[PDB]
Amino acid sequence: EKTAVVIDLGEAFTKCGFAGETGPRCIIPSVIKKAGMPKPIKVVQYNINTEELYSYLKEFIHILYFRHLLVNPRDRRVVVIESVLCPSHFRETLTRVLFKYFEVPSVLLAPSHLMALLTLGINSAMVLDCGYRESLVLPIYEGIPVLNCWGALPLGGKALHKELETQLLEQCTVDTGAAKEQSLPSVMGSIPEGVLEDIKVRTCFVSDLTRGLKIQAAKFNIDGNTERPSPPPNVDYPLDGEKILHVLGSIRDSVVEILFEQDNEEKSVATLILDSLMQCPIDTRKQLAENLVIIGGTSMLPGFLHRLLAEIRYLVEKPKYKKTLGTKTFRIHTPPAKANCVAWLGGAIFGALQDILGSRSVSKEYYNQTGRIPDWCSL
Amino acid sequence: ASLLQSERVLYLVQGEKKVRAPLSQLYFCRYCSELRSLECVSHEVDSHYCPSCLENMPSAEAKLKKNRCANCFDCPGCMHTLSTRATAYYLACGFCRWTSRDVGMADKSVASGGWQEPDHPHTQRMNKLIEYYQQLAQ
Amino acid sequence: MELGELLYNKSEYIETASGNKVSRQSVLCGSQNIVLNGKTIVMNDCIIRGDLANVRVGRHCVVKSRSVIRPPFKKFSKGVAFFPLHIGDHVFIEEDCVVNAAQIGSYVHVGKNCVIGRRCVLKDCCKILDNTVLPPETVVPPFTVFSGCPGLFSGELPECTQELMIDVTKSYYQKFLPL
Amino acid sequence: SVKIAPGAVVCVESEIRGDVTIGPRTVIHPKARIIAEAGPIVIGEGNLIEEQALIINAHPDNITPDAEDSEPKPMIIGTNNVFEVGCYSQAMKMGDNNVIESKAYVGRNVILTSGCIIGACCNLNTFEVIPENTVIYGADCLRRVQTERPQPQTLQLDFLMKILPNY
Ligand SMILES: Nc1ncnc2c1ncn2[C@@H]1O[C@H](COP(=O)(O)OP(=O)(O)O)[C@@H](O)[C@H]1O
Numbered sequence A: 001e002k003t004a005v006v007i008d009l010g011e012a013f014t015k016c017g018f019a020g021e022t023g024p025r026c027i028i029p030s031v032i033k034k035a036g037m038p039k040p041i042k043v044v045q046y047n048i049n050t051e052e053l054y055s056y057l058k059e060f061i062h063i064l065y066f067r068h069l070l071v072n073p074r075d076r077r078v079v080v081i082e083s084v085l086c087p088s089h090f091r092e093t094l095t096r097v098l099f100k101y102f103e104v105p106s107v108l109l110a111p112s113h114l115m116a117l118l119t120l121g122i123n124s125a126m127v128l129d130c131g132y133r134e135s136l137v138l139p140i141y142e143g144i145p146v147l148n149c150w151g152a153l154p155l156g157g158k159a160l161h162k163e164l165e166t167q168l169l170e171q172c173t174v175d176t177g178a179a180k181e182q183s184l185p186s187v188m189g190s191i192p193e194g195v196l197e198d199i200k201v202r203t204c205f206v207s208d209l210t211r212g213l214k215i216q217a218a219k220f221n222i223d224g225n226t227e228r229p230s231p232p233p234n235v236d237y238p239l240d241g242e243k244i245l246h247v248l249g250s251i252r253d254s255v256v257e258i259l260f261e262q263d264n265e266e267k268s269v270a271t272l273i274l275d276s277l278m279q280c281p282i283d284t285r286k287q288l289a290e291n292l293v294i295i296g297g298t299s300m301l302p303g304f305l306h307r308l309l310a311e312i313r314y315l316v317e318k319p320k321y322k323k324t325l326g327t328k329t330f331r332i333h334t335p336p337a338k339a340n341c342v343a344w345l346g347g348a349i350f351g352a353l354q355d356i357l358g359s360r361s362v363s364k365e366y367y368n369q370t371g372r373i374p375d376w377c378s379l
Numbered sequence B: 001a002s003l004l005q006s007e008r009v010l011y012l013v014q015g016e017k018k019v020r021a022p023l024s025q026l027y028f029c030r031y032c033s034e035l036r037s038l039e040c041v042s043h044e045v046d047s048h049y050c051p052s053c054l055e056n057m058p059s060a061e062a063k064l065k066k067n068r069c070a071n072c073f074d075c076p077g078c079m080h081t082l083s084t085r086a087t088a089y090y091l092a093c094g095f096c097r098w099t100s101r102d103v104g105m106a107d108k109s110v111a112s113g114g115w116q117e118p119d120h121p122h123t124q125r126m127n128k129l130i131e132y133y134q135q136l137a138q
Numbered sequence C: 001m002e003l004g005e006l007l008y009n010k011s012e013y014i015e016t017a018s019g020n021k022v023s024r025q026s027v028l029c030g031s032q033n034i035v036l037n038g039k040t041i042v043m044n045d046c047i048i049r050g051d052l053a054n055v056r057v058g059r060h061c062v063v064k065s066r067s068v069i070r071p072p073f074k075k076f077s078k079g080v081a082f083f084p085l086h087i088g089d090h091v092f093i094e095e096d097c098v099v100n101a102a103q104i105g106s107y108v109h110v111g112k113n114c115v116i117g118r119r120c121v122l123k124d125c126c127k128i129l130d131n132t133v134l135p136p137e138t139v140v141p142p143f144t145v146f147s148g149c150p151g152l153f154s155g156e157l158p159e160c161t162q163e164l165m166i167d168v169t170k171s172y173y174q175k176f177l178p179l
Numbered sequence D: 001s002v003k004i005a006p007g008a009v010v011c012v013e014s015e016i017r018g019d020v021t022i023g024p025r026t027v028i029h030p031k032a033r034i035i036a037e038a039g040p041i042v043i044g045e046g047n048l049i050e051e052q053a054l055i056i057n058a059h060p061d062n063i064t065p066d067a068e069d070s071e072p073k074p075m076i077i078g079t080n081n082v083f084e085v086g087c088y089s090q091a092m093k094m095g096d097n098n099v100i101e102s103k104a105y106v107g108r109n110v111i112l113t114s115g116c117i118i119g120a121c122c123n124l125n126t127f128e129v130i131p132e133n134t135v136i137y138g139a140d141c142l143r144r145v146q147t148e149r150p151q152p153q154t155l156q157l158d159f160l161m162k163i164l165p166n167y
């Protein structure tokens, strides 16, 4: 047998490499540069025609299997990591591309949350997945994902990128280099997603709960006269060479707060753990609480894990969660690989198990016969 | 190919999937009678090579070395093939003036043999988990 | 334009000798060391300096206007000297292009206003796109396209370059006639 | 109006205009475009110029304000300075030990220091003094990086003394 390849198709970035390795070999933006198109189209797009999606995935998988990885597709197996409740037609297409065009031996559709649990070694743990599109949580108890007690909110990368763009356009101060030393607002109508992502990573950080709670009430201005903490210094960011955008200190520590803002509904990234944990079985409560896992690149943002764990323990004392989750000890697990590449590492650890892989995985001979991929929906 | 606009007049392929492609890109199949596209045809892997120091490596050596050249290096700041400069050797880029001295990597007495990448921090924990799951899978 | 190469009428003033046509406008300071064996074209306002050179060009070589081919200086501890470059067979240097390259391979299409760096080797059957910077001491493999300010692998060329490029350079030469 | 200096291997075939002031050990390559429109072109020793290099002192043509009384704006250039292929330059004051790359458009009022390099095919029209020993790379973005040590180019210049004769 040969070392099975692991792929993990995401909206922002795709993880690729081989099984039984310390981390992924290639990690790249999930896009393709088609002739005529100035900006490259995104390879994973939900709610489009199958033929157009088929062509994009055919183009992308080709780049992964030749330019990034150097190996024959037909020779060795595949371990496709994809999140639970991934759209039906997308997963059906992705398999149909691998089985028909590339003619792979067998694909294994592992849920990202159960794979993240294997990397630690613990059999039972709560898993939060703060991705690009949606920040999803799914309790895993001793190998069994509990779909009953699922939770998701659109407070990921996309929702954060959009919030940054909005704030920058309000307090817009750019030095074009054409008598634009004076503050010039909205010279460009929209900012490209590639720039916004680079600003987010380098400039913006996650504030402490004490400082963050003041920032929330400050921008609200709820019958108070200038009750904001002192912001960090303003950082100057180059746009397309000559144009120098002066990023305000307030924007850096306020953009993140949309994730941890209550917004009346009581629906934050913090609340989603406690909302799910309260809905879980009464016996499983204390085991899941003690074993928390925080995967996804959105949680890589500096000082996110401290704010989350703090915001949890504050929301615990709130009267809604005070009865059930009152006297619970919330402890976070530190996975071996980085927060972005926890999902991938599980699939590699699973891919190294050649004996179990072949049995669980769906063979091409079965797919060609039936034409029915197994899912958590009815058969 | 590009100077003359070959991407204008296109030839059609017969089969399941119909595609409009330039004749320059397409291939004729002699075994039968039907020209087929770069898309339609199946791709294989023959040989691996480094784009800087053109050295044909075997398939077995690539798997051990993780599809990389030992001698050649690419700069991290910008994506370009580095060059060894002496004073006793330091690695420097031509496009950007990023040096190996900047990050604080010590100069090596031997040219190529001395340079190395540090071992992965969670490599020991990795093998222990594989062997546990391997026994459990068995 | 749609596969077919278009007409270009040259003026009376041009040095036509043994097939090799060289525009009188284009200075080539150092005529001794530079050598043009084949039926080469050098368009107006182009430079081929003899700064300790040995500039050998192809059978059907083409260099469009405002474009420079200068040899690079090798920073050697023994002796600092200008390395003699060798332009390959059927080479097409595009308009306003800068070339400080040592050993340019045969059957290559160098793009418009693209700066090739010092001591840069180009292997046969490659293509550099327009508005691109190849840094000093870089190599580009066959059937490749290098682009961007970094100057890195963009993709692969069509399989039939060796056969196709012959038609291009020979057609341009044949189509390029006096008015 | 020419102040030719001995030791400097300025080639006669290169084009020169206006009230020039030539340096001690400068080496000008052929088809190097130097003009002294308003004020003089002051050249430091070892300031070699290679291929196309548009060095003009035409601030009266650029703006034409009819201000600053006389406004000579004398073009001061430093020592050991490499002007590469196709690089446009117009700097009233320019420091020593700086190497602009090929096809580099330098601004109308940009002051260069030591150990500083402009990116190849990169244009900078905006007026802004360059920090001490920092390099710019790429046209799409500037992406400024501070160098460890300044780079000298003396050996190159010294060898041209031997070549230029009989050319
Ligand atoms: N190392 C990092 N540091 C900070 N932010 C990151 C990092 N890596 C990714 N991100 C951000 O977090 C997001 C993570 O998305 P990712 O988990 O890769 O995608 P998906 O959820 O589709 O699998 C990216 O879109 C990016 O904005």
Ligand SMILES: [Zn+2]
Binding pocket: B050, B051, B052, B053, B054, B055, B069, B070, B071, B072
């Ligand atoms: Zn190599």
Ligand SMILES: [Zn+2]
Binding pocket: B075, B076, B077, B078, B079, B080, B093, B095, B096, B097, B098
């Ligand atoms: Zn670099």
